[PDB]
Design a protein around this nucleic acid. Sequence first.
RNA 1: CCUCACUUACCCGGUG
RNA 2: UGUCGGCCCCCGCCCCGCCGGGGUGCGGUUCCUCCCGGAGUCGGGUUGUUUGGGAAUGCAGCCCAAAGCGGGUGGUAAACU
RNA 3: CACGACCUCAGCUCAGACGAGAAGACCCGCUGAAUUUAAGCAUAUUACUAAGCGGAGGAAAAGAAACCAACCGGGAUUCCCCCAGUAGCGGCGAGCGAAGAGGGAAAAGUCCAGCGCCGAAUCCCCGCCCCAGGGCGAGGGACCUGUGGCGUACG
Lengths: 61, 202, 118, 197, 147, 98, 38
Amino acid sequence: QTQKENLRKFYKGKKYKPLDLRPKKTRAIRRQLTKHEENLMTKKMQRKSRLYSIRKFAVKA
Amino acid sequence: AYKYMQELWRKKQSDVMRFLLRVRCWQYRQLSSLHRAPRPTRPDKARRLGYKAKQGYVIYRIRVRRGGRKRPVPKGATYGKPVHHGVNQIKFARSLQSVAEERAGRHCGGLRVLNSYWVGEDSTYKFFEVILIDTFHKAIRRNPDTQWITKAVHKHREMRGLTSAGKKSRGLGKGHKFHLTIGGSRRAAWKRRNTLQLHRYR
Amino acid sequence: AILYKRLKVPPAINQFTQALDRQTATQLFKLAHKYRPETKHEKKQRLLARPPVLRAGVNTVTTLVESKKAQLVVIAHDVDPIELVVFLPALCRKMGVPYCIVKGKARLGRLVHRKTCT
Amino acid sequence: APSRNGMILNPHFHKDWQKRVRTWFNQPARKIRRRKARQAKARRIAPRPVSGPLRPVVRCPTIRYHTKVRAGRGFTLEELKAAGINKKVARTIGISVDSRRRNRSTESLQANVQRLKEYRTKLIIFPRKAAKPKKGDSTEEELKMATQLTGPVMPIKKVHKKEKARVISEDEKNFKAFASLRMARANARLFGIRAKR
Amino acid sequence: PTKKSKTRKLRGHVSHGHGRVGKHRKHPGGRGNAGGLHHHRINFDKYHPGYFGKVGMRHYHLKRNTTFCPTINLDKLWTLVSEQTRVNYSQKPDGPAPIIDVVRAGYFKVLGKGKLPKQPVIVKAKFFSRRAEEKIKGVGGACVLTA
Amino acid sequence: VRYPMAVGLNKGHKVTKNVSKPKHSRRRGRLTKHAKFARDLIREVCGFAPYERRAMELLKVSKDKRALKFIKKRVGTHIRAKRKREELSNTLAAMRKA
Amino acid sequence: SAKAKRRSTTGTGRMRHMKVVFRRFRNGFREGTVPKPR
RNA sequence: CCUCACUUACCCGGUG
RNA sequence: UGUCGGCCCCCGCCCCGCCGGGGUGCGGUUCCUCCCGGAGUCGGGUUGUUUGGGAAUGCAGCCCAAAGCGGGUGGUAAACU
RNA sequence: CACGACCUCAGCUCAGACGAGAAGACCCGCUGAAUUUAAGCAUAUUACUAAGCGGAGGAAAAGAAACCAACCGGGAUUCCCCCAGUAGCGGCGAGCGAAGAGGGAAAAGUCCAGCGCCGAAUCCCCGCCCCAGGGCGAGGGACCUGUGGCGUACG
Ligand SMILES: [Mg+2]
Ligand SMILES: [Mg+2]
Ligand SMILES: [Mg+2]
Ligand SMILES: [Mg+2]
Ligand SMILES: [Mg+2]
Ligand SMILES: [Mg+2]
Ligand SMILES: [Mg+2]
Ligand SMILES: [Mg+2]
Ligand SMILES: [Mg+2]
Ligand SMILES: [Mg+2]
Ligand SMILES: [Mg+2]
Ligand SMILES: [Mg+2]
Ligand SMILES: [Mg+2]
Ligand SMILES: [Mg+2]
Ligand SMILES: [Mg+2]
Ligand SMILES: [Mg+2]
Ligand SMILES: [Mg+2]
Ligand SMILES: [Mg+2]
Ligand SMILES: [Mg+2]
Ligand SMILES: [Mg+2]
Ligand SMILES: [Mg+2]
């Protein structure tokens, strides 16, 4: 764990890390869209969410 | 330009298209049964079925042995009642186009079948070009309008009747013609109509 | 290529075999060389600083001859699939736009700084 | 099998029905589950009503339910146009919209336009930012007196209006009701054979 | 329950109430409605005449909402209004007559079975029989039609 | 003097009909100037199918009944055979005009 | 053959790695982090 | 309709 | 055990407020102009199968093979409306 | 008659990814029986089941109408109740058998191709600069055989 601590520090910020230094969450989880790709919105629904988002309202009766 | 391509492909019995179908069906039967095409033979039909000119969209030409489905029984011996003695005039419940896209998606496990279209016919062969998608290419995962196919729920959609060619064999649709598949599949409807709903107070 | 010589090719497809003359095509690309689309290597200088041009692509030249705004349309002969340009000579004839067929979709592509222009 | 006088029974138990038997032992458990889902949804939309958007008033199709009104699917685009509500802003203020429905008569149209106007008066819209109250947003006084509406949003009233007792006119007493229907049935059958003349 | 069951008093008796000569076996005459024409013909012909064969035309897509026509007789005609209403207009028989809208109560046709009290009444229904109308006309009142 | 009956020619609950513009989906299959231009152009590029070509042969010898039975055997429905025979007759009439 | 399936299905062996996923799941598949030291 | 031709479909054979 | 009693350590959702990087206005028009669509597919024939679907519910094979005030459906095949 | 462009097609332990198998209660796509019932039996029934094959997910499938309806009209899908052992199918024998409406649970709608405007306004790779979020490279590609924006039957 002293060797891997230096390895995780050496490969920090690198684009390609060794497989044993990558998060081993789950084969299915590793193949999901990243939080960057999940937050990607097309220019059509960016405008649809800008002026046609659900409003906060209340009804008397 | 694409408007003239689809109206041109509707005159298949014209000497212009009859020549093209004659020389392409010849070329398509000189290659292997499964062969990747460098580009869609029908750019108008490909765009209509979801194909884009991005990186990750591949096209595979499939040659299926057309005709009926012979019952694979040894020497035509179907041991049972005469209703099941049919060995010759038996028709596959799934379309030949569905067999082609299911055959391209099985050879390419890393890709997902998007759609498929007709490119040629013969007395013995039907030729289809299947649109496959590399669901891990960044030109596809970073496009929100096509991130749906990158989900795990669409794994081998051509083998579950989810593509347009395979979904037609399921007999689904809204109306009085499709009372057999109310609730999704026909087995979902059969299981619902054959389940004995024994209530708590009955 | 020999099967295209044995069979009776319809005139809508055989019309691309009769291409432009080598002398006429040489002076044709000399004029089109002065209207090449601007490359992205030079278009940035046109933006950070502070016009007739060619219109490539079969979908652009189709709506151009439909609106008879194209003064001259140059079609390639080796376009595969041919259905992309099968209608073009007839479309330019009915609309009264002069059309020519030159040899080489690659030479049209080098004219627009791409692989092949149709 | 038959012993004496009795019904010819037809028990549909010739399949393997024991493999498909759904017992309703979780029926009181799904009532607790569906109740917790409404309460959990109610907190997520805390100011907004839990029942959802406002539904229109539609007429049941067949003659068996002729005189019966019912909460519809969504307001017709014509009903929103006659009420001054844009198509794509009705969903933001909790108004159900469906474009498939049409208005074949003005009775159904005027009934929902009044329902839309009655809703917009009883609607308390909160500003997108509390520091910036815009035009369409409500006043700061009505925001404090705005609570979540439980139950259906504006339930449909079935006004049991009674025809007042009138004096029977002598022209009204001479109306042959049986002959009027009997002529209407006969003329409806001989209508096509009469048009050939 | 099983306390008052007959099997509790058949313990000790060999054949269990099913005879020694003719034992209780598995369907000694067929399953279900078997032999309805061959060996159960007497039972079918004696208690279910008309069971075999076809009669009448076929209606493929029959929708019960098309043929929905609930009926009501004249003896239960005044049940659609309150009793005080029928009595209040009995003391005023000189033209003020109550209106019994049979459509809004859940019926379409009015049949003239029972007797009608001697009161003028305006009956609104979608259909009327010949005798129902003439009993309403005879007792005073009109038969208004509705759609 | 007359009430709305539930039977007959004038059956139904009397309500004022609301008039409005038809659904935009009901313009489907209407020939536009661009759609007619594209199909007429490709008709000049392609020609006619072998059954359209020999059905016009029956139309020029005044065999419209045999031309109808032939097209009805090819395209199927009888309503589609009349529209095809009417279109082939219009084309055959425009040929002898030139 | 339900008995043949019962003798060699998942759970009849060690599950050297699948039993660890069961323990990792109940904590959200936490990785990279460590408990707060003394 | 039938016969005889054409080779490029298709088929067969040979060959490193 | 009972007390949403107390203490301690991890951890999250939603709303509000300021600062920061990316966001770009939308509606109403008995006003003008323009555009408007998924072919070996529908449909037809036939065959097998399937369906409560019965002159053929669905599906598939083979053959035929579309149209654009068109096409599908309107539970009996057909023509006209 | 080499040198170039392109097309088509190859090679690699090339750079970087992906697929495979397991499990399979529920789910999807196929395939498919016979015991059994009809007191025999052949269609039928068993059953569009068992077994066989393929493919998933925490749900799946389905799904925003080439629908229902025939009414004063309803309005995506799924599920429940009822419709209903009904219409109907069937050696019209044994048996089989839904759907519209109605009442409820839950409700959310939408994107393209095409059509034609916008100097391809688009994307990927590589090498980087600042704080997962933003930029740059007279770097390499993809792409006009069509990327992106607008826009889809409610115009
Ligand atoms: Mg877009
Ligand atoms: Mg067998
Ligand atoms: Mg007995
Ligand atoms: Mg005894
Ligand atoms: Mg005994
Ligand atoms: Mg006894
Ligand atoms: Mg005896
Ligand atoms: Mg017994
Ligand atoms: Mg059957
Ligand atoms: Mg009819
Ligand atoms: Mg697997
Ligand atoms: Mg038997
Ligand atoms: Mg027996
Ligand atoms: Mg036997
Ligand atoms: Mg099985
Ligand atoms: Mg899983
Ligand atoms: Mg769930
Ligand atoms: Mg899904
Ligand atoms: Mg059955
Ligand atoms: Mg219903
Ligand atoms: Mg739509």
